[PDB]
Amino acid sequence: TSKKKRQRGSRTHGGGSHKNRRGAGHRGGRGDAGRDKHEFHNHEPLGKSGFKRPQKVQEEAATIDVREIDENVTLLAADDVAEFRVDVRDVVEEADDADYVKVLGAGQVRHELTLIADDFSEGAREKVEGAGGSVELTDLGEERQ
Amino acid sequence: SKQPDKQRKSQRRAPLHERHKQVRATLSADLREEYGQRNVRVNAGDTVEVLRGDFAGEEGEVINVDLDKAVIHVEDVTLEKTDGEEVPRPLDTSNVRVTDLDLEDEKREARLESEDDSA
Amino acid sequence: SKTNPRLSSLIADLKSAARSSGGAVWGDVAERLEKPRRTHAEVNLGRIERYAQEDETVVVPGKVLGSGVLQKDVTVAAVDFSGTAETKIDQVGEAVSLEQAIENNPEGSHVRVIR
Amino acid sequence: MQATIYDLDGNTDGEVDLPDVFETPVRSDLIGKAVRAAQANRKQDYGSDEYAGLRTPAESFGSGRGQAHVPKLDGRARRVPQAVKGRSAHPPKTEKDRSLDLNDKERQLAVRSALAATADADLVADRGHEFDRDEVPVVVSDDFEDLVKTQEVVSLLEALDVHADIDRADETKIKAGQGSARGRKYRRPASILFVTSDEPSTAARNLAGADVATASEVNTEDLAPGGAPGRLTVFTESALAEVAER
RNA sequence: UAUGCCAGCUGGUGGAUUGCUCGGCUCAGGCGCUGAUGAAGGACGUGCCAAGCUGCGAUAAGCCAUGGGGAGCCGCACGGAGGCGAAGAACCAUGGAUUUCCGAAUGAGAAUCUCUAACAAUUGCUUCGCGCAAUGAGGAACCCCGAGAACUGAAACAUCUCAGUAUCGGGAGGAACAGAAAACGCAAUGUGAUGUCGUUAGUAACCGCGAGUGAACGCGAUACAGCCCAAACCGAAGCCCUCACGGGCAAUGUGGUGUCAGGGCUACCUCUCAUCAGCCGACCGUCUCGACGAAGUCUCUUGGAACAGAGCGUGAUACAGGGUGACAACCCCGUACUCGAGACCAGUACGACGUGCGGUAGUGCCAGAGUAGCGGGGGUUGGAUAUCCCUCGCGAAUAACGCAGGCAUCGACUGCGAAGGCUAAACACAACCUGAGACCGAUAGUGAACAAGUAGUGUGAACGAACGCUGCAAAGUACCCUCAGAAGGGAGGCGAAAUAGAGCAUGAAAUCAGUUGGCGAUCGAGCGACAGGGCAUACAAGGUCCCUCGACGAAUGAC
RNA sequence: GCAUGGCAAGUCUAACCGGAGUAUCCGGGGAGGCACAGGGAAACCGACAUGGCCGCAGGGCUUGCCCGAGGGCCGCCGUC
Ligand SMILES: [Cl-]
Ligand SMILES: [Cl-]
Ligand SMILES: [Cl-]
Ligand SMILES: [Mg+2]
Ligand SMILES: [Mg+2]
Ligand SMILES: [Mg+2]
Ligand SMILES: [Mg+2]
Ligand SMILES: [Mg+2]
Ligand SMILES: [Mg+2]
Ligand SMILES: [Mg+2]
Ligand SMILES: [Mg+2]
Ligand SMILES: [Mg+2]
Ligand SMILES: [Mg+2]
Ligand SMILES: [Mg+2]
Ligand SMILES: [Mg+2]
Ligand SMILES: [Mg+2]
Ligand SMILES: [Mg+2]
Ligand code: NA
Ligand code: NA
Ligand code: NA
Ligand code: NA
Ligand code: NA
Ligand code: NA
Ligand code: NA
Ligand code: NA
Ligand code: NA
Ligand code: NA
Ligand code: NA
Ligand code: NA
Ligand code: NA
Ligand code: NA
Ligand code: NA
Ligand code: NA
Ligand code: NA
Ligand code: NA
Ligand code: NA
Ligand code: NA
Ligand code: NA
Structure with missing residues (x-):
């Protein structure tokens, strides 16, 4: 009742x-x-x-934390293995309606990773290198100066 | 139309020629066999046997067929009025069985015999 | 007012075990399951990996989800597991139903609760 | 498990593996929710005329004549809900959403679960069905789909000791209440569901309480009429196989 | 024990209740214009007897033809008399005949009549003659173009809001409108006519920056379709009326060409499968209608009646629904199956006839002005500097030019050609047809199941009810007595039932008559609750209760 | 907000399309929404899959002593 x-x-x-x-x-x-x-x-x-800036002068970055990439490296069997090497752009969802893909550095990196993205944060690089990895900046990433 | 109201309506308001189907009666075993039909539109000439009313059992000749009230008068199936006069007791063809047919009409007989139409 | 006939029986079974056998966890899990679903446990692998130890059965008074990584070879007992959770866990340990746990260990001994 | 296939004579003729789904734990709560939705989702929107009782210029005299402040016209009260011929305060409304949503997963799970309750002779007996068989569901050769006469399906059913259920459904009930006035005068027990593969069984459909379905689209309702699990079913060799992936 | 109180019984009053549904309500599919060839609406007529309703129109509940249908019929409406039908009536479908007066109402006038040939009035063409034509008015809403509130919200109120709502003016169609970019602007190496649906999003934007207001691009769908002029260059090669003759139009340009895959011109290449005009002309599907259509009317019992109980048996590609004297697959209509017809899709798709597409080079030949644009004043919008529109004033270029890309100016870049025009399909409504329902079930549901927009009210605009049910069959009460009596009453007759006897199924309460039980003309007023006595009571559905004694015996507790 | 139920680092489809037993129902449709990172007006930058301590339930042990999810108190990290 x-x-x-x-x-x-x-x-x-x-x-x-x-x-x-x-x-x-x-x-x-x-x-x-x-x-x-x-x-x-x-x-x-x-x-x-x-104030607000005109909607069409705004850029929307598609982000992802290393922790996400790293926790699923083995599982991403359909992605380059070497001395792993993954193109972030092929990992991140919403990476189309996005102005660019950026890797953020939250979490740990327990593997040696070679990451390719349009941008990285200090923490993301430090972590990826500290685990014996490298970070490759895309051509779009050639917008740093 | 599965709706009761519409079913009863169409039956009560059916035009005259569509009322013939409301005055049909089952045929005797012989007649069914003879013409290949289960029932027929009772005509004022046919002979019929009452299968259900208080007059169940009695037989007689159809004296009248009212299409509007979908009812028939059978000879000797009557009621005693107060003054003593004897009037007919309307019967529903559904409680009746045709044992003999009045086939004086070429058209009726033709319909009966053909196998693509029923009378 | 629970709706699921299965969750209902599990609870009744857990009680039967905590009463007969010397178990305390079973009655404990039974009470938590009786409480609102919102309070039930929803644990990811990352947490099981952090506080579990081999030869000590992990008991989740809820459901186990597949986020994070589990390496320890532990036996996890839950009301249910997401499809992914149960897959990752069986690769390095064993995913078990609370109904089996109650059977292989009615005294509910050497068990660790995780929520 | 094993499924004893039968030929049109009612004699065993090999056997196939009963697909896994028939092992899906029976969940009557989820099944009930699936039927409830299907039953609500076919109900029609209704409601009184927006302006019923408002078609008048009635007004209230207010204070002064020892009368209640009720709108009147030609000395007759009107419009207001307490007035005879007045509007209905909170009537049925066309705008009301009378449909019930249901997650595909939750619904598919119920389908599988109802399928499974079909393989339990005890449930099937509790649901009320009459039969003298131990195995269930009743699986039959794909030749069943070629029958044409109802009577032939009767013989097969009597041979399978299942015809008693149709004897059960062979009784209509004249319901209590005004449903009768809207064309819902009768109602009858649900009997056997015949699941074929290419087309519903034209030969079995008219059987008292029988329902015919197809493996690709058989649903929760036919599997569990009124939300009650365990309907006495009869699949088809191929039907049984299709059902497996539902 | 008058007047009288309380409860009941018999009869009444009343019309609740239950059961019933010829009506409503709502949803869905289909379909969709009518009118000077006088509509829609109204008036008055029209029947053997005819007041209402329906139909019809001086040929007046109808006349003719073809098809269907069938032994009956003469509407609702069951009387009396009479008639029609095998010369095939009734009835149904299609087509035709008739079709008074008023009415856009059109010769003129007029409350439906009247006065002495009439497209009145306004227009186009014009043989300049009303000769040939057009318009007018209606329609349930939907649609398009104009005019445009206030209550209200902001807890007052002015901007704002209610709202471009209500209402008013003008008009189209079966759908309207929109529509092949002077676009978009996820800025791009990108998209590619237009509606609409979903979303984008309560986002951007507006706003006493209060309350409130509120898009778009894009995306996913639905459906898809793209073209014609003006001009250049040609220059009468043309069009309309008429059978013809003949007439009219047209150099102030008919017609050819051509329309951003820019075009024209000149010289070439190749070619047509584009486009445009005209011919033919559907399948399928969908909506409706129709034909044919299986199997019990067997036994016993109850009953007024079997459609009930018990027994025996049958069909089912048919166990939807309805009818029939009570619960019916098999008694009747129908229902499954199969088949036929009309309508819509649609003068569409397909097919075919004619035309000719396209490419190179040269050429400042052509390409829509009070426009683009600026200013003053307003309205409108989310449109903010950056919506759309009105009004007054000012006002350009000519493709080597111009507009746009959300402030202005200049340059770059990208997009795109305004100031001419047409355009199928997908979407709105619900008059009309049909179908459907966890809708209502006669104080409900429409105002309206009934004479319903009726009876009736108001000078008028306008307002506006209530009324459903005998019975299986009228067998609707003969005869006799009574009476002023076709009234009523008595007796009697029918039926299972008259306490079914006419507004007649059931028949509640308030309440009335008679009557039964209790109280009662010396006595006090929330009418009772709980205790306990009197009197009253057929059965049923409750069966307990009284006294001696004895057993048990909490608190308490004596003479 | 809450109770119940499905699925879970994901979840759900909308319009609509196909099928069919034709408003139910079966299959398809993830457009888009919310969740998966925040801070900042903006430019722009971009986080603890656990480092310490208490300690409930529960578990362990040789019966006070350990392990102690959740919870509590700190550290530390992103950004203005
Ligand atoms: Cl901003
Ligand atoms: Cl977790
Ligand atoms: Cl675009
Ligand atoms: Mg997407
Ligand atoms: Mg015949
Ligand atoms: Mg009302
Ligand atoms: Mg009732
Ligand atoms: Mg006149
Ligand atoms: Mg105010
Ligand atoms: Mg204020
Ligand atoms: Mg507004
Ligand atoms: Mg836009
Ligand atoms: Mg031309
Ligand atoms: Mg405004
Ligand atoms: Mg009424
Ligand atoms: Mg007045
Ligand atoms: Mg009565
Ligand atoms: Na009214
Ligand atoms: Na009063
Ligand atoms: Na109150
Ligand atoms: Na609705
Ligand atoms: Na129509
Ligand atoms: Na009359
Ligand atoms: Na006429
Ligand atoms: Na005219
Ligand atoms: Na003239
Ligand atoms: Na307030
Ligand atoms: Na106020
Ligand atoms: Na005020
Ligand atoms: Na304002
Ligand atoms: Na996009
Ligand atoms: Na203040
Ligand atoms: Na009958
Ligand atoms: Na201006
Ligand atoms: Na632009
Ligand atoms: Na009434
Ligand atoms: Na309250
Ligand atoms: Na998505």
């Missing part, structure tokens, strides 16, 4: 005095009315802040 199902007989259906459930007066006004007066509480303050 639900709460609704038990209301018949209660007269007020849990609204308290029958003088309560009337119009918007019982809500302090329609919608967000009073968000600056009687009901300012818990509303983000009024005001303008910052």
